[PDB]
Write a protein that binds this DNA or RNA. Structure first.
Lengths: 316, 49, 44, 49, 49, 99
DNA sequence: GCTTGACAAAAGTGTTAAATTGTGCTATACTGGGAGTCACGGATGCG
């Protein structure tokens, strides 16, 4: 009945259970059977590039060799595919170390596969070393690079996450020396950096929380309902400025004719572009210092309380 | 690569399954890389003697 | 003005039309200077 | 595939279902179902309906 | 969730470039489909993210 | 608490009857589509642009193709030449002469 | 309704140094996870 069968009905929707069984459809290779594959890959690649090298000039070749070269290329490609498939189990073994540290397990396996690929494009039989020994380093490289590059919503770069890991490991380890969680003094005494930089690093290592968490001992309110907006438009100000635009530009400006005209350009009230002295001295037929003089006259006359009394109340 | 909207792959009824006349489990196997399916076949090598 | 509300099944072309840009990069905001990135999920 | 992979086309995943829906014809199954509903008596009638 | 797409898609864009074996690309496309399914409506398939 | 948005609000005078002169350019894309961009009075004429559809495009007028170029990617063959000389590869090609 | 000239402060150019960011590389050998069930209507089939 459903009680017994349900435990296996979902088995088809678990890539962790299914990939690890579809993976093992090829037996793991040994040392004797991989040098041949590597040599054949190298031969195929070199022949493939020699086709282009010769075609740069153009010549015709015997049919037998013409077909043998293509066979070599294809079968070296097959050798590469076989070698890639023969070590996905090692990839999984290495990847299963990093489970739970942000990245998804299957993503870690895929990145280990990328590391395996880059390893096979450098494994050299001529040195006599095993494929596993060389490829483990590259698998770790790829997996760790990915896990440090995209395991956070905010990307702390490789060089920064590096020092963050150094700080974390030192903080974890040094506790046993004194029985306390190290503070900036103790951390700085061994990180070879000053306390303020350590504080900056600790702040930089911060991670964002989710708004969807539910607070209030009930599943009704949310963390985010009570977020006050600091940017929200306030109607009164929207009104007030308009009134100022209808009080400053409209009334007080219309009291000195051309003498007030300089204020229109000097402060850019009519266009928004402030203008320098000479730039508005040459629109008329006067020098920059004449503009300065008329501006001083206007400032002295307008600054007087008799007119400033109306304009002051906005921010008195 | 292409992708299929989940709301139509399943839901009792599975709109995609009824549209293509495939059972939900058979359709599940195809979409999710578990079995092959024949898209088309040419009669020139089926009725050719 | 509102007379009725239609709910169709969006095709690929409609989805392309609805977007003024493509998200080609997975970062949200720069960890430093706190600004959106050039191709992230928050790009200006 | 090795012995006559040239005679046909087979695929898996959502791409193959894309092709299947592409070649699927609406005018075809409609008549078949309309006939089966009335032609059939038992469960087949309900499935066609 | 969106990132889980943009990542898995991007890596797939790389894997096609490298011409990786069928298993690698099939697994990548399966993960892409699963991630899009989680993005649209989580929990209707398998365990939720 | 107070929340921030990495933004701000302004309320100065909007208008349409007075506007700075646009300089409109159009770009054709490698996917066959064309788009338009209005630029400012500075009279700049950029030759390349990145369009909405996620693909780069070039000015329809067609001035100064390929403005700039970047280092080509490295390839498995280069990665092989870094650990082998041509003589050994030719020797292997000889070794694979027949079955 | 305003000029010549002279000084000092602020707004730009350019070269260089320092820091900040991105990609590659490490060779004994190791080879395939693990996590705390029942109730409801609908598809199939019996006569």
């Amino acid at each position: 009945r459903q009680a017994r069968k349900d435990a296996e009905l979902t088995a088809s929707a678990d890539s962790v259970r299914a990939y690890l069984k579809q993976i093992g459809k090829v037996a793991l290779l040994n040392a004797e059977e991989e040098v041949e594959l590597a040599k054949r890959i190298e031969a195929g690649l070199y022949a493939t590039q020699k086709l282009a090298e010769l075609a740069e000039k153009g010549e015709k070749l015997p049919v037998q060799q013409r077909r043998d070269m293509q066979w070599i290329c294809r079968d070296g490609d097959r050798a590469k595919n076989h070698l890639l498939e023969a070590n996905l189990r090692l990839v999984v073994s290495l990847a299963k170390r990093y489970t739970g540290r942000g990245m998804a397990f299957l993503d870690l396996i895929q990145e280990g596969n990328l590391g395996l690929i880059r390893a096979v494009e450098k494994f050299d039989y001529t040195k006599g070393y095993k494929f596993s020994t060389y490829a483990t380093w590259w698998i770790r490289q790829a997996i760790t690079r990915a896990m440090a590059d995209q395991a956070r919503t905010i990307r702390i770069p490789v060089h920064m996450v590096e020092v963050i890991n150094k700080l974390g490991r030192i903080q974890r380890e040094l506790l046993q020396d004194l029985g306390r969680e190290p503070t900036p003094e103790e951390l700085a005494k061994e990180m070879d950096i000053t306390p303020e930089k350590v504080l900056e690093i600790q702040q930089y290592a911060r991670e964002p929380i989710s708004l969807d968490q539910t607070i209030g001992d009930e599943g009704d309110s949310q963390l985010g309902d009570f977020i006050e907006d600091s940017e929200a438009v306030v109607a009164v100000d929207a009104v007030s400025f308009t009134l100022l635009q209808d009080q400053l530009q409209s009334v007080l400006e219309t009291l000195s004719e051309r003498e007030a005209g300089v204020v229109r350009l000097r402060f850019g009230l009519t266009d928004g572009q402030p203008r320098t002295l000479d730039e508005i001295g040459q629109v008329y037929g006067v020098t920059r210092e004449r503009i300065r003089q008329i501006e001083s006259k206007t400032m002295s006359k307008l600054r007087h309380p008799s007119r400033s009394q109306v304009l002051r109340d906005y921010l008195d | 690569a292409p992708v299929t909207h989940i709301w139509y792959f399943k839901g009792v009824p599975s709109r995609l399954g009824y549209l293509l006349d495939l059972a939900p489990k058979d359709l599940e196997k195809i979409i999710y890389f578990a079995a092959y399916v024949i898209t088309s076949v040419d009669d020139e090598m089926r009725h050719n003697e | 003005f509102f007379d009725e509300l239609r709910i169709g099944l969006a095709t690929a072309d409609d989805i392309r039309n609805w977007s003024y840009g493509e998200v080609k990069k997975p970062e949200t905001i720069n960890y430093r200077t706190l600004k959106p990135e050039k191709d992230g999920l928050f790009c200006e | 595939q090795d012995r006559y992979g040239e005679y046909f086309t087979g695929a898996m995943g959502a791409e193959s279902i894309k092709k299947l829906i592409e070649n699927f014809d609406i005018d075809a199954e409609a008549e078949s179902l309309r006939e089966v509903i009335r032609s059939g008596k038992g469960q087949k009638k309900l499935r066609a309906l | 969730l969106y990132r889980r797409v943009i990542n898995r898609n991007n890596r797939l864009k790389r894997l096609i470039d490298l011409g990786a074996p069928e298993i690698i690309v099939n697994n990548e496309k399966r993960m892409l489909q699963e991630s899009v399914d989680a993005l649209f409506d989580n929990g209707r398939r398998g365990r939720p993210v | 608490l107070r929340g921030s948005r990495l933004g701000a609000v302004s309320y100065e005078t909007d208008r349409n009857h007075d506007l700075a002169p646009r300089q409109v350019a159009r770009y054709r894309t490698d996917n066959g589509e064309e788009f338009d961009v209005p630029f400012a009075d500075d009279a700049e004429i950029p030759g390349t642009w990145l369009c909405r559809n996620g693909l780069e495009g070039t000015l329809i007028e067609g001035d100064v193709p390929e403005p700039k170029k970047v280092k080509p990617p490295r390839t498995h063959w280069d990665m092989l030449l870094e650990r082998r000389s041509v003589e050994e590869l030719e020797e292997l090609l000889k070794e694979r002469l027949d079955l």
